[PDB]
Design a protein around this ligand. Structure first.
Ligand SMILES: [Mg+2]
Ligand SMILES: [Mg+2]
Lengths: 254, 247, 254, 247
């Protein structure tokens, strides 16, 4: 049946930025769908909660310390995963950051800091995952967390560096899809709207200004992303590669 | 409560136009496998026997409805039948579409108009009728349109300028409806398939995954859009094309 | 010099919807640039003002009655132009209409009325112009007036039928560009934002609601479109075909 | 007052980075032909002699400025020189860009970063510095970035994933800046060229117009964006690609 297309039994999934928000919910979802899940975060202490919730559904998570901006750590992450799980079938390149700062006042260091995690971290993770998948010869699926910020410019908060980085992620996704298609490795991006998670908690002062801009009238919940990440990680999405998928309560329409 | 439960359509009532063949037929069957009661519509009622039998085969009973989606009175009648027989509507898939090949330079107006009428106007009438019934129910709902990668790129070598025009129109109509229906919690989204084996040797080299897709490769996505799994998504277009639109 | 790329001396231009707003300003601009201009409108009486302003710069306009929804009239328009001017080098498919109406309440007749002028009228005009250009063997340029409504959904006024029609125009433009490229006939669309013209005068109640949504802080003037239509009509745009060009004061960015 | 007057750059002061060859060089010359005083910047000052001589040839005097656009202190110095010598800045073209060919799978991080640094970070620093000076002047202004059709599609067969990434970034950075600078009446727009003859036999069949473009075919558009002709346009990307992105 159509339902069995969503089964992840026998699959090995890596999720970066897995300690909170979207990554956390997605890790739990994948375990619920039968996957062996490796969870990565800048500080492995932060992975306790997700690893416990994963145990809670009868799986065992593999926690991995990784700063996705650092090639040596990304290398160590994939080696830890292939070493302990035997390989990798699914990679969610999800670690991301934001700050608020007028473009005219923005130090280069701050511009670059957002590029390094948001674009370079995705590139390093996806490349490492893709290399492992090519070697296996079994195809695979890679998902990147972009943002509606890769399509539109958020207002009133000034986040030009964030917008730049997420447009980069959207198009890097397609570039990798084209190159990896001969290997039957699919690459797609998810572009969430405003989701009530830790990423946006510091921007609570803006929430009430964002809500009237969202046709569905509310910020999303991170649990509302699991169905889509499951879709992309599973056989249900076998014909989809190089796609971006907006999930934003209608925000990008007006 | 787990992610897989978000995809359950038990107790939901779905309408699919153009349900007799291809994508519509696979989606009808998938919705029945997921627990939905399914109304299947086509211009020729006898053509609906195959899908109705397949739905019987997974233990559903389909409601076959004859409808020309270009005709406002027949569309109204389709919704009346479905509301009357099933009690209402939670999901509509506005899928009926047509195509022909003709150089723009030589294209008669009748032919240009014929493709707009089914592909754009039929989607408009169907979504409108479904949205009206959903508004009256007060329970929200989900509407899905079948557009095409032809709404984003121009197919070659075949000349289908009218089809491409009609599919971009559907993509944007979908967004226009999503915006107006959001206050009613009725979500509206489009699917844009690439080449689906419902010329072949010329198309394949252009597709990064190296093959046309199978209509069964659309069922996961149409199920995603019809179910609670997609609760935060509205006004989105989703391309599913083997990578065709990337280069 | 770069300036001579914009010269229309010796060129024959047809502009539909030429009695007011954008079409009127564009007709005057093309005459100022040296073109022989045929101006079309549903009622030829309405072309008096534009024909006079064209005389005002030392040209003579060819006024043509044409309902662009009617094949016989479109046929008559091109025949009148080729007959009197010898041919056609530039075609601006500009006639367009709008009404405001909730989608849920919209009669099919009203939906269709907007499609017929906005999409079908463009198709008929562009096809007729393109056929004449193919026969000439000299290449040519075709410009369509789309709208930012082909990219975004206007709020708060309900104009779903208008949005549908302009997305259609945007993509029809590209479809024609692909087919006409072997003939060296370029086809491009202009997608204006809110421009203070006759088209939007009935929607004056909305103006004050639109303005805060436009980053430049104001509606455009029809004179602010002439440079772009000149660009597309002239040799300055020799390498551009199948492009859409948004000119909207920043509206589509947020 | 006529449409042609909208394109006059007399009395305007323009900065062009990457001005020593290709698009930047043609645009510099075109801006001088249109009456602008033109500062031309490149990483190697001797490379600017050709353009400076061509500008002399139409009766302009170019201001050559050595600048590595990746370096915030040199960018600041470039703007200081231009303000100091010309009195200010009305037009900035952030044009300097680079490319290499390398499979994503094998791409060293240094190489990925190298292309981002010039193509994205160099555009950011240049536009930022120009915008700061324009804000201080209080007279508005116009900023133009050179992106690429590589920001919309993925080139094949050559593997340039880093370049494609950098050009999508530039397209969106341009919009982000347009939004923030609109209150200052500083417009910001991007140009996305296709294949410009500044592999050939593989690319040509993919281009509907059947040829690569010439850099002189960009001058009209860069003049459009730099002059009063484009007064209502900001946050726009303009593709100029012989039709490449349509199929
Ligand atoms: Mg918007
Ligand atoms: Mg393409």
């Amino acid at each position: 049946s159509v339902l069995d297309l969503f089964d992840l039994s026998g699959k090995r999934a890596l999720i970066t930025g897995a300690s909170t928000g979207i990554g956390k919910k997605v890790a739990l979802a994948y375990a619920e769908a039968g996957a062996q899940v490796a969870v990565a975060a800048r500080h492995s202490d932060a992975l306790q909660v997700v690893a416990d919730e994963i145990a809670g559904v009868g799986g065992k998570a593999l926690p991995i310390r990784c700063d996705v901006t650092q090639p040596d750590q990304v290398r160590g992450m994939l080696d830890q995963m292939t070493g302990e799980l035997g390989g990798i079938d699914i990679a969610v390149c999800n670690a991301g950051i934001v700050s608020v700062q007028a473009m005219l006042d923005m130090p280069l260091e701050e511009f670059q800091r957002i590029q390094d995690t948001n674009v370079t971290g995705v590139f390093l993770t996806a490349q490492a995952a893709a290399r492992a998948m090519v070697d296996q010869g079994l195809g695979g699926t890679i998902i990147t967390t972009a943002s509606m910020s890769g399509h539109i410019i958020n207002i009133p908060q000034q986040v030009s560096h964030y917008c730049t980085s997420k447009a980069a992620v959207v198009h890097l996704t397609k570039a990798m899809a084209v190159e990896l298609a001969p290997h039957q490795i699919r690459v797609n991006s998810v572009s969430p709207g405003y989701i009530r998670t830790e990423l946006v908690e510091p921007l609570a002062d803006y929430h009430a200004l964002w809500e009237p801009k969202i046709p569905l009238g509310r910020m999303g919940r991170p649990e509302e992303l699991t169905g889509l990440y499951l879709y992309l990680a599973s056989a249900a999405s076998s014909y989809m590669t190089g796609s971006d998928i907006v999930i934003d309560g209608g925000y990008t329409c007006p």
